[PDB]
Amino acid sequence: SLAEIRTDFNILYSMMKKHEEFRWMRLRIRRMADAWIQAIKSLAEKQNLEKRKRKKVLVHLGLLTKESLGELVQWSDLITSLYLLGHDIRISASLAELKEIMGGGGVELIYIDIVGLAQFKKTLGPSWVHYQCMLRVLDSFGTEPEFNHANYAQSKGHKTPWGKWNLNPQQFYTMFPHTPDNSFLGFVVEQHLDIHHINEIKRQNQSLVYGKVDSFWKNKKIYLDIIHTYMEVHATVYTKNIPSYVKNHGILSGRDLQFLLRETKLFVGLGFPYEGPAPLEAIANGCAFLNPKFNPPKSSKNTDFFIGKPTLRELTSQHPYAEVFIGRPHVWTVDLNNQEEVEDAVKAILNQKIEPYMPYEFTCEGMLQRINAFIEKQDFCHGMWPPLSALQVKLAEPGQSCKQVCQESQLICEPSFFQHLNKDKDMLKYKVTCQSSELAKDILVPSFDPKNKHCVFQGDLLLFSCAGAHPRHQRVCPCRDFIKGQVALCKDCL
Amino acid sequence: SLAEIRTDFNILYSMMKKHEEFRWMRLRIRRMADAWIQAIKSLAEKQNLEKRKRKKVLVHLGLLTKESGFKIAETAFSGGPLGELVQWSDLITSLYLLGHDIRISASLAELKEIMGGGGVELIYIDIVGLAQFKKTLGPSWVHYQCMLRVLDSFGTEPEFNHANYAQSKGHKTPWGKWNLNPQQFYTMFPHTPDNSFLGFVVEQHIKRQNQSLVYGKVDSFWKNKKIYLDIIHTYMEVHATVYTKNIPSYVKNHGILSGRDLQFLLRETKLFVGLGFPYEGPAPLEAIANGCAFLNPKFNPPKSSKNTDFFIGKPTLRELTSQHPYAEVFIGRPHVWTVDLNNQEEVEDAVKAILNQKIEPYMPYEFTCEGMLQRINAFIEKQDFCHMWPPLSALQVKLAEPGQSCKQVCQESQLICEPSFFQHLNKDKDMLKYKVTCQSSELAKDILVPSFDPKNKHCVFQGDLLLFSCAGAHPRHQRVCPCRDFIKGQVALCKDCL
Numbered sequence A: 001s002l003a004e005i006r007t008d009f010n011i012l013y014s015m016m017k018k019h020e021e022f023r024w025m026r027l028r029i030r031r032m033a034d035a036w037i038q039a040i041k042s043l044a045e046k047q048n049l050e051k052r053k054r055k056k057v058l059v060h061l062g063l064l065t066k067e068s069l070g071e072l073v074q075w076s077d078l079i080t081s082l083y084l085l086g087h088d089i090r091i092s093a094s095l096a097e098l099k100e101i102m103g104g105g106g107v108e109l110i111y112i113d114i115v116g117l118a119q120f121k122k123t124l125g126p127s128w129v130h131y132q133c134m135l136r137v138l139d140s141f142g143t144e145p146e147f148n149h150a151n152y153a154q155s156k157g158h159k160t161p162w163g164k165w166n167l168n169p170q171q172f173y174t175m176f177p178h179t180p181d182n183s184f185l186g187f188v189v190e191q192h193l194d195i196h197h198i199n200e201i202k203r204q205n206q207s208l209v210y211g212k213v214d215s216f217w218k219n220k221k222i223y224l225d226i227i228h229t230y231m232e233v234h235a236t237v238y239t240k241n242i243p244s245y246v247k248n249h250g251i252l253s254g255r256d257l258q259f260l261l262r263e264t265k266l267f268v269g270l271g272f273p274y275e276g277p278a279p280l281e282a283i284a285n286g287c288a289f290l291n292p293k294f295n296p297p298k299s300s301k302n303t304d305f306f307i308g309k310p311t312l313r314e315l316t317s318q319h320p321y322a323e324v325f326i327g328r329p330h331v332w333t334v335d336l337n338n339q340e341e342v343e344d345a346v347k348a349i350l351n352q353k354i355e356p357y358m359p360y361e362f363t364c365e366g367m368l369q370r371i372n373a374f375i376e377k378q379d380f381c382h383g384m385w386p387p388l389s390a391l392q393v394k395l396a397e398p399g400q401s402c403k404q405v406c407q408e409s410q411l412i413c414e415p416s417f418f419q420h421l422n423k424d425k426d427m428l429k430y431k432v433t434c435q436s437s438e439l440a441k442d443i444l445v446p447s448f449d450p451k452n453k454h455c456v457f458q459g460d461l462l463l464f465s466c467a468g469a470h471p472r473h474q475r476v477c478p479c480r481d482f483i484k485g486q487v488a489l490c491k492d493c494l
Numbered sequence B: 001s002l003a004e005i006r007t008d009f010n011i012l013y014s015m016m017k018k019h020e021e022f023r024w025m026r027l028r029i030r031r032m033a034d035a036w037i038q039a040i041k042s043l044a045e046k047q048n049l050e051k052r053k054r055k056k057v058l059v060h061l062g063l064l065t066k067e068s069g070f071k072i073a074e075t076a077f078s079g080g081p082l083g084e085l086v087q088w089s090d091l092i093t094s095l096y097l098l099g100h101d102i103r104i105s106a107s108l109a110e111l112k113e114i115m116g117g118g119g120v121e122l123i124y125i126d127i128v129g130l131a132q133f134k135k136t137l138g139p140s141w142v143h144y145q146c147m148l149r150v151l152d153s154f155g156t157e158p159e160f161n162h163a164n165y166a167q168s169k170g171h172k173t174p175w176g177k178w179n180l181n182p183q184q185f186y187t188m189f190p191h192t193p194d195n196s197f198l199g200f201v202v203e204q205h206i207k208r209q210n211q212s213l214v215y216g217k218v219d220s221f222w223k224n225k226k227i228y229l230d231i232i233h234t235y236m237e238v239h240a241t242v243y244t245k246n247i248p249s250y251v252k253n254h255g256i257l258s259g260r261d262l263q264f265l266l267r268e269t270k271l272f273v274g275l276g277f278p279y280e281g282p283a284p285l286e287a288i289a290n291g292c293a294f295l296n297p298k299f300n301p302p303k304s305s306k307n308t309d310f311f312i313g314k315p316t317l318r319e320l321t322s323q324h325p326y327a328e329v330f331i332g333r334p335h336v337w338t339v340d341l342n343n344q345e346e347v348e349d350a351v352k353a354i355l356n357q358k359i360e361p362y363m364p365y366e367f368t369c370e371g372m373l374q375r376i377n378a379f380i381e382k383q384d385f386c387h388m389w390p391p392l393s394a395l396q397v398k399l400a401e402p403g404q405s406c407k408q409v410c411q412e413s414q415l416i417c418e419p420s421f422f423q424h425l426n427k428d429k430d431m432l433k434y435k436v437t438c439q440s441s442e443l444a445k446d447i448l449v450p451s452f453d454p455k456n457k458h459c460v461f462q463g464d465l466l467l468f469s470c471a472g473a474h475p476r477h478q479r480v481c482p483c484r485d486f487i488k489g490q491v492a493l494c495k496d497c498l
């Protein structure tokens, strides 16, 4: 009943069967096996992984069910991580498997997607709610508290089918750390590198466009022409939106793709798809990424793709994580409408020398560290973690969210600490003095009126929210530090 | 001036980096580099490679010229003509390692420039490229005609090569008619002894006993194979690499794989399953080289221009006895089971046998790095159509029965027809030496002669030397047929031809 790390994948391979998607996952794991094994050994050497209880874990991929790319990568990496950490995983990709595993009892943790969660509620019936606190819900784009709370969402006039699960929003697991109301899960970036001679290996004038679908290339000719002034333009398109000068390789194997990326100086974003793995994979191969700037930023308010998504988060660019957490020289964020910004970026990139780069949180060891911490430390099944010693209170100005204020102090909003900031005497300890006070059910409180020292406190604890700016008042905001290149975990959270 | 073997690929990689087309060829060479380097050194140690003249060699790939309408997509092994791309890469590699001075061309402009610049001693070119060569050079193209070596997968038979005879026979193909020495055509497999076999190298770098993998990347190849596949599926999982509605739902698709990933899938696979199409090509040999058995659809009756649209217009009447005749005849059981798909019993017994077989990776010597180096080096040093070889000492005359070709009669003696010797068999005096006495004789311009009527001791001799032909059966008479031995696993070369 204690967990032991695994260092061989044969059992994993036998458990991942009967779906095309798992065939693809098995191949990526085989490519990545040596990296994985080194990382689990390296982690266990640096950090105490003794005396962990072996958990029985349901992994339900609603995505692969009949009754129902980055999601499949994340699933694979989560499964791999759980297996290496020594947990007892029950993989389900059908209603029948879901029924049996749950019907068998002793499940202690449930990893599931949004489509799988509807299936869980239906299959289990009313008692699904008895397992609520064990759910970890892979949800790429994130769910904000305002949408997660079914009655509040309705009260706010939201007309989406999504959200309304009434979970602790930290139970939503996201693709990138864009939504501090949620937990960041992420994935691992594949890299097969060479890393010294990379500038010799690279064909200095070779660009590769990101975008397998012809429709994504609609209206990018001028942009591409600028790029083509300095660089060959290559593509992998499965073609009447593609300029005649494009060297279209079509569908390439993973191994042929890796070769092409090895030789590529610049991976070119068109604007869509949003926030995938592929720009990080190019950067991991020493490519620069030209990242379309979205001014105005894209959200449910102006973009069809985002209408109905249970979040008001806005995207500042095609890949905001790349833009903000990586930046130059690897990533050049440019407005496609500004021909001069594009041109200068391309010229700079041509004259740059860059090394393969991967943020630590997207390596094997990084992901193992993160998910191990969540498994060992995150518990929503009691009345904890992160430790209160990590709390640093900041005051957001009007029109500024708790998300924003923590960010600009080089911190991150930590929603589990809202509870510690929700009454007069607790405020005093953080240099915040309440003259007058009152309770409201709103995502925007706890709030502070600095004119007349008035404190408004949260009266529906499910509505605590990093997201959201007070139009008039200041917000009192819970922040925490993070381990560098590992934003999911405070310094004292291992 | 003398050739030196090369043991490093940096110059080759620089040359090939000059055209986008060569990208995938560079990758295949990198995977295969160590094998190639060992083979060139091994050959030079076993066999005398000193004192070879370094040659200036044009390599013109008509296939890759914009004007032929090819696409960059088709330059990848996974999206293009597997055989042709592989062969070009392996020929270039071989020439580089042997120390020759290679001038690669993939455009009209480059062809014009390299030939426009004098000095070429040997020309490797495809059929599309040959039409291009004639225009770029003008009438003096004939001055280089003897230096041509024409990569032509499926082969050109003398009957089609001879433009006026072809027309006299009513053939309406646009192909053939080059009036070359037919040994100047270089084929993918040794199916056409009127031509030379060039071939290629099979790359080679756990096994699930009940795993079969179907050969056929496109849905259309799977049309009407359900009963065949169902039989296979009775004993084995059926996997695919397809990149949908002809494929049974039990099939386990892996999608597009290449490199180490495809090799891994093959190493794991017990049986590689042929559907009937495509014909020949490298893929079955690559599976066999990774320890897979190959289920090889038998064509009864054999496929040719007479019954199959694909073969119409091809400058040859060669028939295919199976999807992969080389695999059938030159490899055979236990690695290759040749079965009629329409015969449920044959298929089932094959599949059961294969399940219970234990077999090793296998590759005939001619498809190894060292084998191909040996072959192409011999051609370069010994084959000359300009100014003998093979030596006359290798000639063994046989008499083909009526309805039997010179190709066939040599084959059944474990020999191969050797067209350069026909000239030594073409008049009364020369016949006597081979137990053939001519009472009466006459000359005819026919692919089928020299012929012998044994009833009335009548000899018909060849009056157009360009019509000598291994291919072709006399419906009435016997043929006098030139045969030669070969080095084992190396059918291109007689025992005394190194």
Ligand SMILES: CC(=O)N1CCC[C@](C(=O)O)(c2ccc(C)cc2)C1
Pocket: B077, B078, B082, B215, B216, B217, B241, B256, B257, B258, B259, B262, B266, B282, B283, B284, B286, B287
């Ligand atoms: C990488 C490659 O050359 N590929 C991708 C898989 C499909 C392919 C074909 O069918 O021609 C093929 C070739 C060879 C074998 C043994 C199996 C499959 C082509």
